[PDB]
Every structure is written in structure tokens, then in C-alpha cells.
């Protein structure tokens, strides 16, 4: 009478003679017994996860890569050989470039031992890029930067002899748009029965209008406290 | 089955530090949704229990008899003349007998817990902690009175909330009654 | 729903709440990486310490990485690390590993001990540690000869004060409860979310695998709607709480980055 | 998969990056039922084989 | 072209929120028809209250979610505005000594520029270059007394000794006007012997 | 739309430009003295 | 929407009416007829229209 789905394997649990099935902290079934063998069998959920697509840009090439998050590639190969995989597209079945990462299995890219700056983040310190190597997608471990060593000594010091002037930029938002809602035309829209039925729900409209009015008032003082600091208008000669 | 977890359970239990009744080594006692029974006599003379609502062979009644090796159960309209004693020494007539059962054979405390709900009669037992389950009947008779035949104790259960503790092997080790403090 | 087609078709009439939920979760996941990026990635050079480690008497072995152990962490970092402890839910690994953070910290320490404040604002100019300490003493209104007359005493006091931090952190396990509270709250929220599935919001059965695959009657949409609404409300509450906690974490990360930039790369006069 | 990304983004052009499209699952292959070792049958021989 | 994306993200988010809010009206929350003008003007049973209640509850939930998201975004907008005002007041109307607060390097002055729903700051900084190695010394002794530099640092070109500031190379002759006397010569570790000028 | 309205801001872009120009003029003509009195 | 401007009840009782986001020609057309929703049109005699 207990229905479900999963993988059945042998476990090391020790059930009492009057026990039938066990549950974990979250009250989910994880172990049952054979009514004809009386052995202990554990239940594990079948594999599942998300799929991510990597693209260098449609204006450069049409090649892509596929990432199966949180799964071993052996199960993926077993499911591709059969018809158990849910995605119906398996265009990468002939690609022998299969690599295993800590974030999942990557199909459609080759791994190299070199290190470069991270272009497209994947996870666990691994990034991908599009290089000429005949161009293709490669995978590598990201690097933090070039190493440097300082000549420390007991009686050494460095003093600069020249200088330069630099200019930098910085952008920061100040405010946003102001919006108002009627709360009546959106729900009913010229309907007397709808209005009579809505009058029994209380005053959510008042709270919403008050919140919107407060936001709209704060949006002006946000700019007032930033730009309105001086009291006189100075002019250049 | 549970392993290394604390589970909060609400069911019929016996409150801690309750007012139990002590008898020597026999009137009819009520059955208030459960009766706790205990004994410690070596080679006890008191064996068997009587259940029913009228106990006059006018309605179906339950009768159980325990011995040294096995345990049998018979449910029928038995007629007790004056008082059971230990078979002709307990009943005198029988009519419209429905079912009969038998069980597998097998300090010195001996405990029992009786409960009937939703048309099922199940009991608990343990010899020398928690009590393991032992039997269950799908008998649908109406039980209202309790009677024993031959020191024992009688206690009534109440709906309480308890916190149970399970070890690695899956056995109850300690319990906490939420009330009383 | 779970493995069900009728419930899946009934869910399509509610709109695109799941799109907004996934968008919010993706935004939080992206912000969690830039929070660490803006804090730990402030240098462009990987500075290394010289082979000799004589700095006029000061001992920094308790904060420098240990090459003997496989993990390139400091003695203190090991003590800090050794005292801090399935249906549609997935945890995403971070982008930067712990080894990269340790390398960044080691490069920061090396730059600080080899150049002082020069690598912070310009080129990394070498300078011996005593002179640097003398200028730091001068920067607070004390003559520089005080250090040249008490260097040994000051180095002994520094070495004695450094050792006490180890004992203080070893004898106090609750000193790091602030980092444990976040993990506890996240685990408790996940447990509550996975536990909410065992409720019956005005239906004949609680769990999904009880009626979604056994339903005896042929009209049951009114029974599935209750569970759908309840689970949608639970997901919305979870997302709202996650957004609030993410905003708090963003504020804390900005504060930590400001503290780093104003206390490590220079000397501040703020009380 | 590129067409699926275009459908998710609702555009014929897509910049460089990584995008989530869908999820994958493994489907069951067969069903198994279990019931007690034996079955206590009814004694119809006492009525028919009389 | 990806310079000002921070200002465009807010507009994109607001437009997407408005589009989602106006699109949510075409759904049916367990009713016979989705749009409002489809049943609110074509229905005949007067017990359609149970049908109208579904749409009422759905639209109320949508409005509540919209308002919650608007408040959450307005909080961050207020935080960013406060940060921008603080940066303006501390970088434009004065010269700050906070590291990396008004740019990278030694801050000199700043200039503000207006922008749609934002502001742009131009920071002018000072960066040294072309450094050279020199030999340094803690102090000097001429009459058996230790002489400490008043401002700058003692440097040696290999044959002679000079004193100069730490931010720019400019050798000067060591005189009594640039140094002060403190203690004897036997206490300082690493001291050197050199003559001191006295006009 | 269906009951949706956008409210115009209080200050126009020309006023913000005038404020920015006044700030720049004060900075280039008095330095930090106008900021402290 | 409609907004009312008041200098304070302790100073005077005169007020002003603001119709947000609409041209005044349509407002005058609706006031000359009976198509305007607000039933109060006491300010129709005021020629101070801006």
C-alpha cells in the first residue's frame, strides 16, 4: 500500500521485529522492508537538477555548451544511452569532450592546464572563454593575478622621482520613478456588484495608497538632500 | 522506525505521578478509554481478564485466558453465574460464538495496557522501559466494563502530550511529560 | 505538484509567480558573489614574503601561512575554521574557493609588512619595519625617539599580546556565534519550508503523494486549489524573508568593506 | 538549446553569458508490487467437496 | 557602452514590474473566464459572487506583492541616495584623507556632474612614479649625540648623506635646523657616524 | 492604463543643471571657503 | 486624480482644484455637459484657468 518512486539498495539499518518502515527528521520515507524477505532496503530519490547554457554571443558564433548542475556524468551517460532523460535534445551525443567539475558535468568544452583571467564564471573557481586555440570554447582555472616580490632589507628604501595626474569616474543612483494606483478600476473597472463585494474586505486600498504616497514623497526629499545644499547661486567671471 | 531524533507525540498516556489504586493478592471496574495493569507475583494465580458491557450473556463479550506457555482468546456470550474463579469455574453457557484466536508460545514485573478504538482491540506487554505491541483484534464489540479473575494495580489513561527520545538502534530511552512542571 | 499533469495544467492559470521567484533568487545569488568580490578583491598584485623573516624582533608566525599543512592557512585561521559547523531545492557552490581567499589574505599581509601604506596609494616602496613603526608613532603625536629607545620592550609586548588571542579564541567557542546564527536561520527556514508540505489546507489529505495520485472522485480541482494556494503563499513568504536577510547581509558586507579599506590600507584618525 | 535560450529570453539575439533554461529528470522504467509471502485461503472444500 | 548600466537597471526593473502587473489581468484564478470585461458584463447568474471573489483575491495579492517589492527597492534607493549625499559633502566641499573614499590615490579635488536619476563625480588624484633605491639610516652622531630628522628621511647616494621628503626626491645638506638632539649614541641600534653642519 | 499613473518630479533638469553650475563656480572661485562659510 | 489645495482652515476657506494629467479643454467640454463624474462644479464660474 505504500507507493512511491526511487532507487532501492541494501542498507545497514536494524529494525525491531514490529517495525515496518522508517522516517527521517522531516518525516519522509527512507527505508522499508520486503514482506517476503524481511530485509532492510533504503530508498533514495532519483537524479534531478537544473540545466545551464553557455554562449559566447550570437554575433560571433553559434556554438554553445551544456552544464548539468549537481550530478555525476556516469548517470548522464547511462540516461543518454537509454530513453530515460527528460530533455529530448541530445545533439552533443557524439561529442567526446566530457569533463567533470565540482559544480557538475560540462559537455562541449575542452579543459586546459593553463590559467587566464575569468571571462564567464561557471563555479568552484572554473571559468570558460572563447579562444582561437579553429576557434572553440575552452575551460580553465581562473588566476588571481601576476606575482610580485619586494626587495626587503634592513637598510633599503625607495623614493619616487616623478608623478602623474589621474582622473576617475563614479556613478551613483539618486531616485526612481513615481507611481500611483487607483485600486478600484484595476480590480473592478466600472462594476457596481464588484464594488459592493469589495467593500466587505476592509481598507487594504487605504494602506496601499498611503505606502505609494510615502514613497512618492520620499523620492523628492532624496534629491533635495543631495542637490539642494548651497543657498546662493554663484557665477563665473 | 526512528534513529537519534526527538519526536513530540500526542496520544493516550498515563500521567506521571498519578493516583494509582493498589489491591491485595473483586468488584467490576469501569473501562475509561484504557486501563493500565501491572503485577509482580512469581507464579501468579491471577490469570485472564474479562471484558464486556453488560456481562450477563445478553450481548457479545470478550474473554481471555493466559497460561504458562501460550495464550488463547475466545469471544462469545459467556454466562458468569456468580463470580469467575480459576472452564466451568468461570462460565456456564455459550451462544452465538463468533471468533477464537491463539498466540505463539514462548525483578519479575509484568505490565499490560488495554485499549479499544475504531473497532480494534490491541494490547501491550513487557517482562523484566517502553512496552512492545503484542496483538490486535478486529473485534467490533462495545466494551464498557472491566473484570479480572484469579497484588495488582489499575490506572486510567488520559490524552496528554509527551516527548520521546530514540537512540541509534531505534529504541525509546527517555520521555518527558509536558505538564506537571 | 510533483510528477502530476492535472495539477500542472491547473497551475498554469495563475500567471507567472515562479518567474518572479526565480528572478529574485538569481539576483540574490549574483549579489552574494559580488559581496565577497568587493571585499576581498582589492589588490592586483600577489606579493610574497622574503625567505628570511627577521623584522627587528617582531614575530608574525601566528598570522603567516604554514607550508607544512596541506591547506595554506594560518594557525589562527585553522582554529577559526575548526570551530564553525530534496524536492526542488538545490544549493549552489560559491565562485571563489577558500584557498583563493587565503591567498588574497596572505598577499594583503605581505604587502602590509613589506611596504606599509605605499602599496595602498601608489607603488610598493620597500622600507624596514622599525622605520615604519617610528612614522606610525609620529603620526599620533609621539616623538620617534621613543621607539628607538624602547624597540625591544615594544616588540616583547607585541609578541605577548599576540599569543593571548589564541587562548582567548580557544577558551571561548561562542565568540563566533554571529557567523553561526546565519547558518542556523537558513537551515531552520529550509526545514520549515520542507515541513510545510505535510499540511492539509482544508482538504482530505495532507501530503502530495496521497491525493495527487489516488484521488477517487472525478471532480477534485477544488481540493487541489487549496494545496496550490497554500504552497504558493509559503514560497512567497520564504522569498520575502530571503530578500530581507539578503538586504541585511548587503549592508553588513558594505560595512565590512569600508572597515577593511579604512583600517588595513592606511591609518585612520576616526575615534 | 540555443533556440530554447532564445525562447526564454524572447529575442533573436543573445549576448555572452550563462542562462538557466530548464531542468532534467530521469524517468522510471517499470513498476514493482509486493504482497505477503502467502495467503490464507478459504476452506471451500468443506462445502463443495462434501 | 556598458558604462551607465546602473542607471538603466532601475528603469528596466520598473518597466518590467509595470508590464507584469498589467499582464496579470489576463489570468483566471479558478473561474470561467480570465479577463474582467468577459464576465463582469456578460455573466447572468446572481450567485457569481464565488466567481468574482477569485479574481478579487488574485488581484489583491498581485497588488500587495507589487507594493512589497516597491518598498524593498525604495529602501535600497534611499540607502544609495544617502551614500551619494555623504560622498558629495565629503569630497566636493573639502579635501578628505579617507583612503579610497574620493578616488584611488591621494585626493586633491572633485567635480560633480548631473545625470538622469543619478550623479557623476570626477576625482583628481596624485600618483607617484619612477622610484629609485637608496640606503637609509635611523640617525647620525657627530658629537657623540644622536640626531633625529625633524621632517623627511636620511638617504645616501653611496658616498654622501642627504635628507629629503618621503614623497619627492630632493636632497638637502644635513644641518642643525633640520634635526634635533635626543639622548646619546650608544642606545640607537644601527646608527652611523657623520658630520653635522652649523652655520 | 487600468488605473496606473506616473507623477512628474518636482525639480526639473534645468534646476539641477543650475545647481551643478553654481557648485562648480563656487569650487573654482573660492575653493573650500564657501563650504565652510 | 483630483487634488485640493488649502492655505489652512484658520486663515480662509478658499481652496483650489487640480486635475492631474489632463488637458483643460476636455475638462471644460465635460463641465458644459453632464459627463464629469464629480457632482460639484462650483468653480465653473471662475475664469482663472491655467
Structure description:
The structure is cut from a larger assembly and holds 7 copies of chain A. Helices cover 17% and strands 36% of the residues of chain A. Chain A has 237 residues and is α+β, with helices and mostly antiparallel strands. In chain A, the strands form 3 sheets. The first copy, chain A, has a 4-stranded antiparallel β-sheet with strand order 1-4-3-2, with no helix packed on it. A 4-stranded antiparallel β-sheet of chain A has the order 5-6-8-7, with no helix packed on it. The longest helix of chain A is centred in the last third of the chain and has 24 residues, at 204-227. The first copy, chain A, is extended. The relative contact order of chain A is 0.07. Strand 15 of chain A pairs antiparallel with strand 1 of chain F.
- Give the helices and strands of chain A as they follow along the chain: EEEEEEHEEEEEEEEEHH
Largest interface: A-E, 50 and 72 residues
Strand content of chain A: 35-45%
Q: What structural category arises from helix and sheet content of chain A? A: alpha+beta
Radius of gyration of chain A: 32 Å
Task: List the quaternary state of the chains.
Answer: part of a larger assembly
**Number of DSSP strand runs of chain A:** 15
Strand order of the largest sheet of chain A: 1-4-3-2
Give the secondary structure arrangement, pairings included.
The structure is cut from a larger assembly and holds 7 copies of chain A.
Chain A: E1 7-10, E2 22-23, E3 29-33, E4 40-44, E5 48-55, E6 65-69, H1 73-81, E7 98-100, E8 104-107, E9 110-116, E10 120-123, E11 126-131, E12 136-142, E13 146-149, E14 156-173, E15 178-181, H2 192-198, H3 204-227
Parallel strand pairs in A: 9-12
Antiparallel strand pairs in A: 1-4, 2-3, 3-4, 5-6, 6-8, 7-8, 10-11, 11-12
Amino acid at each position: 500500500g505504500l507507493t512511491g518512486t526511487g532507487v532501492l539498495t541494501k542498507s545497514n539499518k536494524k529494525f525491531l521485529p514490529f517495525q515496518q518502515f522508517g522516517r527521517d527528521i522531516v518525516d519522509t520515507t527512507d527505508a522499508v522492508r520486503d514482506p517476503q524477505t524481511l530485509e532492510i532496503l533504503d530508498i533514495t530519490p532519483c537524479s534531478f537538477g537544473g540545466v545551464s547554457v553557455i554562449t559566447p554571443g550570437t554575433n560571433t558564433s553559434n556554438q554553445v555548451a551544456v552544464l548539468y548542475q549537481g550530478v555525476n556524468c556516469t548517470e548522464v551517460s547511462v540516461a543518454i544511452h537509454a530513453d530515460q532523460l527528460t530533455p529530448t535534445w541530445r545533439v552533443y551525443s557524439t561529442g567526446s569532450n566530457v569533463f567533470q567539475t565540482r559544480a557538475g558535468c560540462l559537455i562541449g568544452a575542452e579543459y586546459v592546464n593553463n590559467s587566464y583571467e575569468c571571462d564567464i564564471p561557471i563555479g568552484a573557481g572554473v571559468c570558460a572563454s572563447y579562444q582561437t586555440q579553429s576557434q572553440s570554447i575552452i575551460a580553465y582555472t581562473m588566476s588571481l593575478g601576476a606575482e610580485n616580490s619586494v626587495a626587503y632589507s634592513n637598510n633599503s628604501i625607495a623614493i619616487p622621482t616623478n608623478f602623474t595626474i589621474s582622473v576617475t569616474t563614479e556613478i551613483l543612483p539618486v531616485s526612481m520613478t513615481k507611481t500611483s494606483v487607483d485600486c478600484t478600476m484595476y480590480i473592478c473597472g466600472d462594476s457596481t456588484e464588484c464594488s459592493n463585494l469589495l467593500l466587505q474586505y476592509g481598507s487594504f486600498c487605504t494602506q496601499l495608497k498611503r505606502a505609494l504616497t510615502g514613497i512618492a514623497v520620499e523620492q523628492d526629499k532624496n534629491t533635495q538632500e543631495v542637490f539642494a545644499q548651497v543657498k546662493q547661486i554663484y557665477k563665473t567671471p | 522506525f526512528r534513529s537519534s531524533v526527538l519526536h513530540l507525540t500526542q496520544d493516550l498516556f498515563l500521567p506521571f505521578f498519578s493516583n494509582v489504586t493498589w489491591f491485595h493478592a473483586n468488584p467490576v471496574l469501569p473501562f475509561n478509554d484504557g486501563v493500565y495493569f501491572a503485577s509482580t507475583e512469581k507464579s501468579n494465580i491471577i490469570r485472564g481478564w474479562i471484558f464486556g458491557t453488560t456481562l450477563d450473556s445478553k450481548t457479545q463479550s470478550l474473554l481471555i485466558v493466559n497460561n504458562a506457555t501460550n495464550f488463547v482468546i475466545k469471544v462469545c456470550e459467556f454466562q458468569f453465574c456468580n463470580d469467575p474463579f480459576l472452564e466451568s469455574g468461570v462460565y456456564s453457557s455459550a451462544n452465538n460464538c463468533t471468533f477464537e484466536y491463539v498466540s505463539q508460545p514462548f525483578k519479575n514485573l509484568r505490565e499490560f495496557v488495554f485499549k479499544n478504538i475504531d473497532g480494534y482491540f490491541k494490547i501491550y506487554s513487557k517482562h523484566t522501559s517502553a512496552l512492545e505491541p503484542l496483538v490486535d483484534l478486529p473485534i467490533g464489540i462495545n466494551i464498557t466494563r472491566f473484570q479480572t479473575l484469579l497484588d495488582y494495580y489499575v490506572g486510567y489513561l488520559q490524552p496528554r502530550t509527551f516527548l520521546l527520545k530514540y537512540n541509534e538502534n531505534g529504541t525509546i530511552t527517555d520521555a518527558v511529560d509536558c505538564a506537571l512542571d | 505538484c510533483g510528477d502530476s499533469t492535472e495539477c500542472s495544467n491547473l497551475l498554469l492559470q495563475y500567471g507567472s509567480f515562479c518567474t518572479q521567484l526565480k528572478r529574485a533568487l538569481t539576483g540574490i545569488a549574483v549579489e552574494q558573489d559580488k559581496n565577497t568580490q568587493e571585499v576581498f578583491a582589492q589588490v592586483k598584485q600577489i606579493y610574497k614574503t622574503p625567505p628570511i623573516k627577521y623584522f627587528g624582533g617582531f614575530n608574525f608566525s601566528q598570522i603567516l601561512p604554514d607550508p607544512s599543512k596541506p591547506s595554506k592557512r594560518s594557525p589562527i585561521e585553522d582554529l577559526l575554521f575548526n570551530k564553525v559547523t530534496f524536492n526542488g531545492l538545490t544549493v549552489l557552490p560559491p565562485l571563489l574557493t577558500d584557498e583563493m581567499i587565503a591567498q588574497y589574505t596572505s598577499a594583503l599581509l605581505a604587502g602590509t609588512i613589506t611596504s606599509g601604506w605605499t602599496f595602498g596609494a601608489g607603488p610598493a616602496l620597500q622600507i624596514p619595519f622599525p622605520m615604519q613603526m617610528a612614522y606610525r608613532f609620529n603620526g599620533i603625536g609621539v616623538t620617534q625617539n621613543v621607539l628607538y629607545e624602547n624597540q625591544k620592550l615594544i616588540a616583547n609586548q607585541f609578541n605577548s599580546a599576540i599569543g593571548k588571542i589564541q587562548d582567548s579564541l580557544f577558551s571561548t567557542p561562542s565568540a563566533l556565534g554571529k557567523l553561526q546564527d546565519v547558518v542556523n536561520h537558513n537551515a531552520q527556514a529550509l526545514n520549515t519550508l520542507v515541513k510545510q508540505l505535510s499540511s492539509k489546507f482544508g482538504a482530505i489529505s495532507s501530503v502530495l503523494n496521497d491525493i495527487l495520485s489516488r484521488l477517487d472522485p472525478p471532480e477534485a480541482e477544488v481540493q487541489i486549489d487549496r494545496l496550490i494556494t497554500g504552497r504558493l503563499q509559503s514560497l512567497q513568504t520564504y522569498v520575502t524573508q530571503q530578500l530581507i536577510r539578503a538586504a541585511e547581509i548587503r549592508a553588513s558586507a558594505n560595512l565590512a568593506a569600508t572597515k577593511m579599506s579604512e583600517c588595513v590600507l592606511g591609518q585612520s584618525k576616526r575615534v | 538549446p540555443l533556440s530554447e535560450t532564445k525562447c526564454t529570453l524572447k529575442s533573436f539575439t543573445v549576448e555572452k553569458g550563462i542562462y538557466q533554461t530548464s531542468n532534467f529528470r530521469v524517468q522510471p522504467t517499470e513498476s514493482i508490487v509486493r504482497f505477503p509471502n502467502v495467503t490464507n485461503l478459504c476452506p471451500f472444500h468443506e462445502v463443495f467437496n462434501a | 557602452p556598458s558604462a551607465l548600466g546602473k542607471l538603466q537597471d532601475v528603469v528596466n526593473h520598473n518597466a518590467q514590474a509595470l508590464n507584469t502587473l498589467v499582464k496579470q489581468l489576463s489570468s483566471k484564478f479558478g473561474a470561467i473566464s480570465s479577463v474582467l470585461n468577459d464576465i463582469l458584463s456578460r455573466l447572468d447568474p446572481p450567485e457569481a459572487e464565488v466567481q468574482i471573489d477569485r479574481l478579487i483575491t488574485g488581484r489583491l495579492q498581485s497588488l500587495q506583492t507589487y507594493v512589497t517589492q516597491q518598498l524593498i527597492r525604495a529602501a535600497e534607493i534611499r540607502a544609495s541616495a544617502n551614500l551619494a549625499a555623504t560622498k558629495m559633502s565629503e569630497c566636493v566641499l573639502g579635501q578628505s584623507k579617507r583612503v579610497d573614499f574620493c578616488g584611488k590615490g591621494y585626493h586633491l579635488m572633485s567635480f560633480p556632474q548631473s545625470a538622469p536619476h543619478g550623479v557623476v563625480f570626477l576625482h583628481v588624484t596624485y600618483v607617484p612614479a619612477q622610484e629609485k633605491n637608496f640606503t637609509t639610516a635611523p640617525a647620525i652622531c657627530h658629537d657623540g649625540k644622536a640626531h633625529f630628522p625633524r621632517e623627511g628621511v636620511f638617504v645616501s647616494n653611496g658616498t654622501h648623506w642627504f635628507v629629503t621628503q618621503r614623497n619627492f626626491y630632493e636632497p638637502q645638506i644635513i644641518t642643525t635646523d633640520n634635526t634635533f638632539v635626543s639622548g646619546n649614541c650608544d642606545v640607537v641600534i644601527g646608527i652611523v657616524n657623520n658630520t653635522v653642519y652649523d652655520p
